Swiss-Prot record, chains B, C:
Highly expressed in placenta, skeletal muscle, liver, brain, kidney, heart, thymus, spinal cord, lung, peripheral blood leukocytes, pancreas, lymph nodes, spleen, prostate, testis, ovary, small intestine, colon, mammary gland, breast and breast carcinoma, and in common-type meningioma. Highly expressed in fetal liver, heart and brain. ANK repeats lie at residues 39-71, 72-104, 105-137. The modification (3S)-3-hydroxyhistidine is found at H67. Poly-ADP-ribosyltransferase involved in various processes such as Wnt signaling pathway, telomere length and vesicle trafficking. Acts as an activator of the Wnt signaling pathway by mediating poly-ADP-ribosylation of AXIN1 and AXIN2, 2 key components of the beta-catenin destruction complex: poly-ADP-ribosylated target proteins are recognized by RNF146, which mediates their ubiquitination and subsequent degradation. Also mediates poly-ADP-ribosylation of BLZF1 and CASC3, followed by recruitment of RNF146 and subsequent ubiquitination. The gene is TNKS2. The chain holds residues 488 to 644 of 1166 of the full protein. Oligomerizes and associates with TNKS. Interacts with the cytoplasmic domain of LNPEP/Otase in SLC2A4/GLUT4-vesicles. Binds to the N-terminus of Grb14 and TRF1 with its ankyrin repeat region. Interacts with HIF1AN. Interacts with RNF146; this interaction leads to ubiquitination and proteasomal degradation. Interacts with NUMA1. Changing H67N: Enhanced hydroxylation by HIF1AN. This is Poly [ADP-ribose] polymerase tankyrase-2. The lineage of its organism: Eukaryota, Metazoa, Chordata, Craniata, Vertebrata.
Length: 12, 158, 158, 12
């Protein structure tokens, strides 16, 4: 399936 | 089998926002290297997704490819939009990122932003010509993916 | 998952030397697409490997990436050198190709030219500053890869 | 495992 991009919403 | 140590370190530095290490490893040959042990993100994908503004700026000024697609067909603008990074999304667009680009499932950055509940990102995309009627492979538009609570995003795309 | 129809057609046209079709399908977005069904070659990889000069030239003029690596770490210069395509190699070098680049196994273009017995290619790479002492992951230099029959290439390298 | 690049030596 389609997986989320590398990254995250909050730096903390 | 795996990335060279130099490329692995560059990728990790992009992710970590360690711009001094990025500057020491980045060359025209390595700037668009790919993380073969993950989803083939480039340094710019990592910097964009982890909101590393200084790194994004450096990469863009040193040959990083705003059109590079990872294993799933995502460009770095998808990463920025999915995770709500407004300044990063702005820098990518200013360096010629295509707003209506689509991944392997035909999700555009606007599909990502809408699904993730990012109003100002959605609005930014629209002004640069993002098409809110584009259907992904499922037949869903970015409006279709908006969570019910987000009536403001619904109103915008509507 | 497979490539889009448009990307499949561009990759095929590149391999075929069908420049007219390349012209129709080549955009900033697609010029460096990857053959996810095979070894992730870009259009430039295919054009370079199959000695499609008109297509190589067109792709380079439209932003094709001389530094793009395929699934095994090869850049298009690797493809040109492995298959003895002198003009393509020269075009890649003229458009910024780095001669000392190495794949995932640390094979350089010169290792390829040497192993494949491509005398003119070896000379060209040397004439352009390739390092004949670079070892691949087996500990082998390009000289080590020259077949014993090929005494002229041996002579050329040492 | 290392395989050949996409391409071929001779156009014919």
């Amino acid at each position: 399936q389609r997986e989320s991009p590398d990254g995250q919403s909050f730096r903390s | 089998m795996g990335n060279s140590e130099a490329d692995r370190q560059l990728l990790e530095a992009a992710k970590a926002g360690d711009v001094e290490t990025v500057k020491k490893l980045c060359t025209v040959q390595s700037v668009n290297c790919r993380d073969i042990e993950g989803r083939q993100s480039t340094p710019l994908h990592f910097a964009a997704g982890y909101n590393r503004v200084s790194v994004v700026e450096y990469l863009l000024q040193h040959g990083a490819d705003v059109h590079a697609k990872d294993k799933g067909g995502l460009v770095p603008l998808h990463n920025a939009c999915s995770y709500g990074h407004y300044e990063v999304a702005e820098l990518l667009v200013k360096h010629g990122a295509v707003v209506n680009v689509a991944d392997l499932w035909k999700f555009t950055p606007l599909h990502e932003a809408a699904a993730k509940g990012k109003y100002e990102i959605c609005k930014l995309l629209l002004q640069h010509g993002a098409d809110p009627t584009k259907k992904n492979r499922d037949g869903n538009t970015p409006l279709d993916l908006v969570k019910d609570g987000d009536t403001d995003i619904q109103d915008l795309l509507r």
